[PDB]
Amino acid sequence: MENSGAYTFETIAREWHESNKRWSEDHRSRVLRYLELYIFPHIGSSDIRQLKTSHLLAPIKEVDTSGKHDVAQRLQQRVTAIMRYAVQNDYIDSNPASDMAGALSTTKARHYPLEHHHHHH
Template structure:
């Protein structure tokens, strides 16, 4: 029984000499037979060398955030937009929705490769929007870096293609004075 008064099934186990407890489920909703089956499944994970509590936490985190690029990008944007002006935050999201989500937004983030990102960015360059292509690549890279920090990805394919893009052009030019 917890301090709040709820009754739950728990399993006490040790990993690396440390005692841990795994919550299997609430008492009246989870029968004793089901609790024993859950405990046995957790014991099998432990025998395989993994911490069942860590597996459960990872599954909860992935369910909360999602694994597709679009879901992760929306989570990243939700956290970042508090630090941005509303107008710029809207621009970032609309750029991703128009240029990136149709290409690989539904794919799991771990399946995204540098050629996929390069193809999406090349489509922007084909429209003649080189500066926009560089900005969108930067946004994609920020999403991927955030995913790496969150443990959802291992690499940043958008950073790899940076040198493969056409120059952004534009830049500052000196004034031309007519005489």
């Protein structure tokens, strides 16, 4: 990229998103403000190349306590997914969130998983 910058956590989310995995992206342009603030509340002082383990989940637990606990899962999935691409691009080397809120309540069976091979742009 000629214009050096925007290498942050923001653009990495766009990278896999532009292949279109989910909808409602039109709204996200504005929602980004609300999202960034609440997804990185106590951890918004760190760089993408310096993420930590599930200790950062503590402030996210706050909204969980409000009874809106389902949103926390929707939030965490971003950092969990992106961090996997981060490891696949090997620019973080290690895996800070190896679990990150693994097993919420009701565990399923997952009989013959498919989530082990994915490649299509």
